[PDB]
């Protein structure tokens, strides 16, 4: 019910409502992003422990 791997394989690749498709990089609209980009280390939804 709580897996960083399956959650990422959906949000990271199928569809996440916060991703902005840039020209070089993807940006994340999620308010809890420490970087503002769409990454695997950055994304607030996949990472189960976050700050």
């Amino acid at each position: 019910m709580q897996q960083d791997e399956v959650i990422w394989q959906v949000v990271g690749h199928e569809f996440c409502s916060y991703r902005i498709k840039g020209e070089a990089q993807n940006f994340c609209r999620n308010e809890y992003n420490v970087t503002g980009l769409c990454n695997r280390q950055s994304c607030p939804l996949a990472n189960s422990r976050y700050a």
């Binding site: 019910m1 709580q2 399956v6 394989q9 959906v10 690749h13 199928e14 569809f15």
Partner: protein
């Protein structure tokens, strides 16, 4: 697959209740974004009208 045995029932007033339900076995089944897509893809063409 180990996750969250019990769920809590909320009354009308919004306060939690002491009763609880074991998380159903369905709530651990595989999560497949590709298989849901290629089934929703099909099942959504079933209320179509011909032109």
């Amino acid at each position: 697959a180990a996750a969250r045995p019990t769920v809590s029932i909320y009354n009308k007033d919004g306060s939690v209740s002491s009763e609880t339900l074991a998380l159903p076995f369905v709530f651990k089944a595989p999560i497949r974004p590709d298989l849901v897509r290629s089934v929703h893809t099909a099942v959504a063409k079933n209320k179509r009208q011909p032109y």
